[PDB]
Design an enzyme around this catalytic site. Sequence first.
Site, PDB file in Angstrom:
ATOM      1  N   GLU A 122      43.586  31.201  40.040  1.00 17.07           N
ATOM      2  CA  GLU A 122      42.374  31.865  40.551  1.00 17.07           C
ATOM      3  C   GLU A 122      41.392  30.666  40.902  1.00 17.07           C
ATOM      4  O   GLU A 122      40.683  30.222  39.950  1.00 17.07           O
ATOM      5  CB  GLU A 122      41.641  33.040  39.854  1.00 17.07           C
ATOM      6  CG  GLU A 122      42.795  34.212  39.973  1.00 17.07           C
ATOM      7  CD  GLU A 122      41.929  35.257  39.180  1.00 17.07           C
ATOM      8  OE1 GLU A 122      40.786  35.473  39.107  1.00 17.07           O
ATOM      9  OE2 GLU A 122      42.690  36.174  38.744  1.00 17.07           O
ATOM     10  N   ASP A 190      35.860  42.796  44.028  1.00 12.15           N
ATOM     11  CA  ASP A 190      34.595  41.659  43.381  1.00 12.15           C
ATOM     12  C   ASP A 190      33.962  41.083  44.854  1.00 12.15           C
ATOM     13  O   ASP A 190      33.847  39.743  44.832  1.00 12.15           O
ATOM     14  CB  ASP A 190      35.183  40.613  42.704  1.00 12.15           C
ATOM     15  CG  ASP A 190      35.628  41.111  41.497  1.00 12.15           C
ATOM     16  OD1 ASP A 190      35.156  42.382  40.962  1.00 12.15           O
ATOM     17  OD2 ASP A 190      36.547  40.492  40.827  1.00 12.15           O
ATOM     18  N   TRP A 337      43.495  47.673  38.481  1.00 15.80           N
ATOM     19  CA  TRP A 337      42.884  46.719  37.581  1.00 15.80           C
ATOM     20  C   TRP A 337      41.506  47.571  37.095  1.00 15.80           C
ATOM     21  O   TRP A 337      40.487  47.662  37.501  1.00 15.80           O
ATOM     22  CB  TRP A 337      42.429  45.596  37.988  1.00 15.80           C
ATOM     23  CG  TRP A 337      41.571  44.673  37.231  1.00 15.80           C
ATOM     24  CD1 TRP A 337      39.888  44.485  36.735  1.00 15.80           C
ATOM     25  CD2 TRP A 337      42.156  43.403  36.488  1.00 15.80           C
ATOM     26  NE1 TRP A 337      39.990  43.702  35.740  1.00 15.80           N
ATOM     27  CE2 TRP A 337      41.034  43.164  35.472  1.00 15.80           C
ATOM     28  CE3 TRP A 337      43.487  43.012  36.407  1.00 15.80           C
ATOM     29  CZ2 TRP A 337      41.522  41.767  34.726  1.00 15.80           C
ATOM     30  CZ3 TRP A 337      43.693  41.968  35.461  1.00 15.80           C
ATOM     31  CH2 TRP A 337      42.581  41.466  34.449  1.00 15.80           C
TER      32      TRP A 337
END
Lengths: 368, 368
Positions: A122, A190, A337
């Site tokens: 990431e 996010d 998640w």
Amino acid sequence: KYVRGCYFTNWAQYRPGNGKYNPEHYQANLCEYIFYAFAKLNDDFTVDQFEWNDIDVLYPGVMKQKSSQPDLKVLLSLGGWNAGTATFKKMAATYSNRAKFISSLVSFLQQNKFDGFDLDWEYPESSDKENYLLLCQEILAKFEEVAKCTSTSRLLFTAAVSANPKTVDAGYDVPALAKVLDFVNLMCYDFHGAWETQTGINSPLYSRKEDSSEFKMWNVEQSSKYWSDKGMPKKQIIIGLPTYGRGWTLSDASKTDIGAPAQGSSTATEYLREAGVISYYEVCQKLSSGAKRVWDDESKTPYLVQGNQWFSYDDVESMKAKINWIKQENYGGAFVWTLDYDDFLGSFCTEHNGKKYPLISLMQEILG
Amino acid sequence: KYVRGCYFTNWAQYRPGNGKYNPEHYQANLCEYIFYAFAKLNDDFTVDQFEWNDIDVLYPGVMKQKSSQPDLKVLLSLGGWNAGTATFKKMAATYSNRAKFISSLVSFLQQNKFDGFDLDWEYPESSDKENYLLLCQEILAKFEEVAKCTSTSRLLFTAAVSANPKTVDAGYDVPALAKVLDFVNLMCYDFHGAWETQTGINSPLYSRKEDSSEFKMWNVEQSSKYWSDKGMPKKQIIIGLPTYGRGWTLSDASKTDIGAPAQGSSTATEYLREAGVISYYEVCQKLSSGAKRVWDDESKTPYLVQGNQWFSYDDVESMKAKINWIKQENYGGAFVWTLDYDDFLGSFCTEHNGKKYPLISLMQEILG
């Protein structure tokens, strides 16, 4: 046929009281794939456990779940946000570095009985684009070589990937990665959070008219479409579903809409103990305490207001909309998640009559 | 410090009622090694399942037991008495034939998640002695190469071997085999049975003064000592323990000693349905029905008389003496043939107060 994936996290064991999540809280047939977050990438590019009890306790505990779900596949994930990129960058930079990592990885996967590997770098940058592709090509080639030794089925290979089109452009050779990755776990969440000075939606399904133009792609529908436009077949694009939310402290408790001014992150909650985030089961506790819920039909997500605390989150209604949309648009499936943010006991929420995993069960129910 | 092994048999699923044995009937920590009897050696030297539900049902059912016993190892056995030697003899005759078999076996083992291989050729003869050693050396070599190729711990490799010193002399290069086999399962049983015209002891611990000279070695003490004298280190000699007995029909119901004349095999029993054999739990059923037990202190074994039916068998006292003897002499451990002949439900015997596995539990309890 749809992929249904679920992330297990090896730090959820540290939550207090009824928030503590153990491998045995898993429920048979919830997921076809469990992704284990996370292993550790050492400075010398070898792979090892991250938590002190991964190898001796948690890995076997997760593998135990195959006894009641014989088709369950368990992959080991590497990377994540906290790990950063510095070691990945150096590891991918030469063949010798990559070969050393791949050798250590394969031994670690085999010794611990994993079914595959999930690369969660990431994120690769422009300077990493070539190296990241080579890494992936050489991982698959190794996995194929191992399978040829005995004519066994080869280890699986997936990756969790950015939903930001500019990031996608810089770091990923999408057509070339499609030939090498079994599928990609699209991290379409996010999009907004406490780092911003106004409230917003963690994981909107659609854009909203009030979105500024810079954010028109920052939603499930357009982020997934971008990967498809870049050359990833839809059946390899797995849509990410959060079971947590993100929260702010409002500047003004009478201004509670999406986009309301914020003065900082939300106060750390009882079980996650991390300012700016909340679990679904903690949302249920706040709702029982009288928190106000608003359904935002444009984005297909709810938000929660309690005094000057404001959270964007996902619930049964948003999961229903999103998972039905996955079928309608024929993407590859869904992943969640995480396992440990849902009401995994069935006792935190009242409105589901004690159902365990009210969010995560929807994958099997709608896609299964 | 001591090996504890147990044979599972894939035909015990066909016994009726409380004799039917399922993999979930295994009890955690009974054995460190389960040996799966048997796979099939085809005429063309390839390996395959023997029973219609081995790969689909029984293999994973046995592997499931690792969930409650993480250190459990499961090995696949090939051969046995009924398979005979014809195909083994041809397969071992040339490098070409052995390589075809070995490649087939290695694939079958890894595809089905076995931890090792147990060779039960019964028995190599003088014309096989060199081929048998070559076969074993080449199996181990392949196992070592496969371990490197797949980055795994190498497969275990054992053999069940004759307890007849003449057979050992003719068929086994004992010092060379010690270098390549992890250990040997000494088949120190079937010394006497219904093929003889008089009663005798299936598995005597020691010789008896009334044994004729031809049988002085036909017991646990001497047959194991012979393998030692021939060059097999004691820690590689695993002592076999039968949980079945063998039976005769007496010629004269008033003559019931060891050595009494017999007119044929014992009548087939309710669950095993094979004239000449009986299970321990079937002995328990006959003890409840008033059968007479006699303890032979010389051999440390019991026999059972019921009318004109006479059985030599093993029980808690004989297992106690044998397993305590194993420790006294520092042999390598013990194995039982079979799991499914013990009182595995605790439903047939009364003297143990419903204890499951009254016989096989003695390995863990005494050898630790």
